[PDB]
Amino acid sequence: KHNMKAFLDELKAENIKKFLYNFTQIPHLAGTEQNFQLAKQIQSQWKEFGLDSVELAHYDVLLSYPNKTHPNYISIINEDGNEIFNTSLFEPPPPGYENVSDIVPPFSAFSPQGMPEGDLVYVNYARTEDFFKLERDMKINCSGKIVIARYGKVFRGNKVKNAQLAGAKGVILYSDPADYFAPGVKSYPDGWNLPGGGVQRGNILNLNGAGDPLTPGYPANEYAYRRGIAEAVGLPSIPVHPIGYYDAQKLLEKMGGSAPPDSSWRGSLKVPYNVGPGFTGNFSTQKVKMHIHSTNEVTRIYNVIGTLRGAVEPDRYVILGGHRDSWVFGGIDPQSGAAVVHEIVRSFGTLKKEGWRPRRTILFASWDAEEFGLLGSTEWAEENSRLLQERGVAYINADSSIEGNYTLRVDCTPLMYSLVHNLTKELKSPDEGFEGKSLYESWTKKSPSPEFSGMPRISKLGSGNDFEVFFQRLGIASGRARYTKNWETGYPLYHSVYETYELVEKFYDPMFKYHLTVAQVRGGMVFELANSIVLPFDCRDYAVVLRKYADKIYSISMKHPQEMKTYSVSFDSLFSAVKNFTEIASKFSERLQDFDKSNPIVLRMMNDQLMFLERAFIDPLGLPDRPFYRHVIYAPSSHNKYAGESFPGIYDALFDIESKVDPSKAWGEVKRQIYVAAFTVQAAAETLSEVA
């Protein structure tokens, strides 16, 4: 038989290991020759593996790179102007790689150039609430200061936007051992902890789904018209640079002004974590100075697009996608995912060599420039939006397969909950002490949902990865899955030079059994999605979360009873819409089960309803000021791009509403958002009614 079990048993841990080792010997930074060569390799091997076509799709996009002859760094400088302290120029390379060249030094991608100088202020995680604390309660003013903030909690881009909206003239990011050093574990090479000389790279854009900063809406092709830098989307206007905890200790040890306001502003370094501004008395006339000489430049990037044509519905597309570019070696991010996708492609190809084809078309992608803002996926989706809108069944992402070795992590649309539950009951748990148990069982035991005894946690999709365009812009049902750590107690070597094949083989997954599990989940999902006769989506799962979401957003609004009375703020229409969806979805399931199994057209009609249901939640006007976030139920949090927010139009219109100077207008906009949500939920529901 050529069935799922066939596909699944053909997958090998050992192949995944080889591929990972092969993908991590040299750096594969976006836009560099080596990442082009790795693209040519994937392309040619997807061809050898049997795909019907494998092409490169290239775009010319805005990237960012340090100046090789003029390095970035930060100083303490004295009243004369002598730089008595310099941050490092590079991370100590790890054992055996100390002669690899082309290790990009730590930098904040897309920082503008500058040499500002001034007094520090320490802003904790640079969250929206951290600035509230700072401005509102503590009365400290960051205007014209240089803020220093620890990584963690939120996407670094948000941090930078917040600092900028607070009047800062520079930002310094560092990794605190409280957030990046697990107790009792050694620093790399002897453990998986971050060393004091380790630094996290990463971009600091606020793109809000735009893709290439120069070409929002349209693929960055050869004739593309490009905005000028000044109209570019998402670029920070103050310089920014990241450092390790050794360098940070030196910047923080002299801090004066006010004490931290409480213990949650305190990391683990032996320093006061005073907030500032400026240094204490003896050193009060010393200053901090940044030297940033990074350049932005339009650079060519290459996606690899593989096609396995479907036998019955070739005009329906299941997409398995993940990126190939890395900040350095990408031992985890992303090559632990890419090696999984490679083996998934190999296994699908093995069946195809024996004459099998999936029912629907499967598209396989190796995206470029993800690290620089999801630019490869997004340009490609901008280019093929019409095909994807009308033919796209689902998108399964495939970035890092592990960030932990404790349990499975799944984030996806409600429409895929049941598929995930089912797939995992059929899969072996790789966990110590669940030998012979199902993956469902181990996952459900180690990671239970808040809502339902006997069910595992499944998160909602945030952003910060290549499914963003497919889900929040286009309304294609999306999911992702990986191994992760204990939810109670990213990973410490995230985006640092220390993230290597040895990191993975020695400390995360020596047997490659977690990787293999993750290949089964990803691959199994894609298999079901590309092969089940009826698409494996359950609309009733959407009905349940919508109720939960409407309860939640109503509760936020109920913190303002007085205002709800004065302005006649009602959630009746939303609750009505969600009830209707529940009823209609339920009648649709009955039909989907009772229908005349033999009829292709009726089957196609009902599959089209399932396929267009996610699509139904798209509003072609977008959310306010974020035209590329069009999904009404899910957007990335406006305070944290990694986190998903439900009913975001309403959440944001309620956020901090008590601080608005014109309440009438603000509550007017809450009501508008309520209407949009109710309408959209009703409209979605109606796509599941009988069609005529």
Ligand X SMILES: *[C@@H]1O[C@H](CO)[C@@H](O[C@@H]2O[C@H](CO)[C@@H](O)[C@H](O)[C@H]2NC(C)=O)[C@H](O)[C@H]1NC(C)=O
Ligand Y SMILES: *[C@@H]1O[C@H](CO)[C@@H](O[C@@H]2O[C@H](CO)[C@@H](O[C@@H]3O[C@H](CO)[C@@H](O)[C@H](O)[C@@H]3O)[C@H](O)[C@H]2NC(C)=O)[C@H](O)[C@H]1NC(C)=O
- Positions annotated as catalytic residues are 370, 570, 608, 631
- The answer to whether 680 contacts Ca ion (rule: CB under 5 A) is no
Strands 295-308 and 108-109: unpaired
* Residue 647 φ then ψ, to 5°: 35, 60
- The answer to whether 70 contacts ligand NAG (rule: CB under 6 A) is yes
List the one residue out of 362, 618, 572 whose CA is nearest residue 471: 618
The gap from C-alpha 221 to its chain's centroid, in whole angstroms, comes to 25
- The answer to whether 593 contacts ligand X (rule: CB under 6 A) is yes
- The answer to whether 683 contacts a copy of itself (rule: CB under 8 A) is yes
Residues 147-176 binding ligand NAG (CB under 6 A) are none
Strands 146-150 and 170-174: parallel
Burial class of residue 5 (count of CB atoms within 10 Å of its CB; 0-12, 13-18, 19+) = exposed
Total number of residues that touch ligand NAG (CB under 6 A) = 17
Q: Is 481 annotated as a binding residue?
A: yes
List the one residue out of 408, 339, 409, 365 whose CA is nearest residue 526: 365
Site string for ligand X, 422-451 (x = CB under 6 A): x-----------------------------
Sheet containing strand 392-397, edge to edge, reads 53-65, 295-308, 360-367, 313-323, 392-397, 477-484, 407-412
- The answer to whether 212 contacts Ca ion (rule: CB under 5 A) is yes
Pair 514, 439: CB distance under 8 Å:
no
Pair 506, 17: CB distance under 8 Å:
no
Site string for ligand X, 400-419 (x = CB under 6 A): ------------------xx
> Among 270-278, 428-436, 583-591, 620-628, which window interacts with a copy of itself (CB under 8 A)?
620-628
Residues 193, 195: Cα–Cα separation, whole Å: 6
List the one residue out of 505, 347, 365, 405 whose CA is nearest residue 18: 505
C-alpha neighbours within 13 Å on the C-beta side of residue 614: 29
Give the CA dihedral 168, 171, 174, 176, nearest 10 degrees: 10
Beta carbon nearer to Cl ion, 198 or 464: 464
Q: Show the tokens assigned to 487.
A: 């939810």
- The answer to whether 34 contacts ligand NAG (rule: CB under 6 A) is no
Strands 644-646 and 634-636: antiparallel
Q: Which does 459 bind (CB under 5 to 8 A by kind): ligand Y, Na ion, a copy of itself, none?
A: Na ion
Total number of residues that touch ligand Y (CB under 6 A) = 7
Pair 431, 407: CB distance under 8 Å:
yes
> Among 70-78, 172-180, 223-231, 239-247, which window interacts with a copy of itself (CB under 8 A)?
223-231
Residue selected from 247, 538, 645, 669 as contacting ligand X according to rule CB under 6 A: 538
The gap from C-alpha 400 to its chain's centroid, in whole angstroms, comes to 11
- The answer to whether 334 contacts Zn ion (rule: CB under 5 A) is yes
Residues 37, 43: Cα–Cα separation, whole Å: 10
- The answer to whether 249 contacts Ca ion (rule: CB under 5 A) is no
- The answer to whether 385 contacts ligand Y (rule: CB under 6 A) is no
- The answer to whether 675 contacts a copy of itself (rule: CB under 8 A) is yes
- The answer to whether 692 contacts a copy of itself (rule: CB under 8 A) is yes
Q: Show the tokens assigned to 44.
A: 């040619």
Q: Show the tokens assigned to 390.
A: 């009308």
> Among 164-172, 262-270, 283-291, 330-338, which window interacts with Zn ion (CB under 5 A)?
330-338
What Cα–Cα distance (Å) separates residue 661 from each residue in 658, 664, 665, 673?
8, 9, 9, 19
Total number of residues that touch ligand X (CB under 6 A) = 6
Beta carbon nearer to Ca ion, 57 or 543: 57
Q: Is 371 annotated as a binding residue?
A: yes
- The answer to whether 616 contacts ligand Y (rule: CB under 6 A) is no
- The answer to whether 577 contacts ligand Y (rule: CB under 6 A) is yes
List the beta bridge partners of residue 625: none
- The answer to whether 192 contacts ligand NAG (rule: CB under 6 A) is yes
User: Minimal CB distance to Na ion: which residue?
Assistant: 459
Residues 121, 410: Cα–Cα separation, whole Å: 38
- The answer to whether 405 contacts ligand NAG (rule: CB under 6 A) is yes
Chain residues in the site for a copy of itself (CB under 8 A):
52, 217-219, 221, 223-225, 307, 309-310, 312-315, 317, 361, 383-387, 390-391, 570, 572-573, 600-601, 604-605, 608-609, 612, 615-616, 619-621, 627, 668, 671-672, 674-676, 678-679, 683-684, 686-687, 691-692
Annotated binding site for substrate, which residues? 156, 203, 370, 463-465, 480-482, 494-495, 641-642
Chain residues in the site for Ca ion (CB under 5 A):
211-212, 215, 220, 382
Chain residues in the site for Zn ion (CB under 5 A):
333-334, 399
Annotated binding site for Ca(2+), which residues? 215, 218, 379, 382
Annotated binding site, which residues? 156, 203, 215, 218, 323, 333, 370-371, 379, 382, 399, 463-465, 480-482, 494-495, 641-642
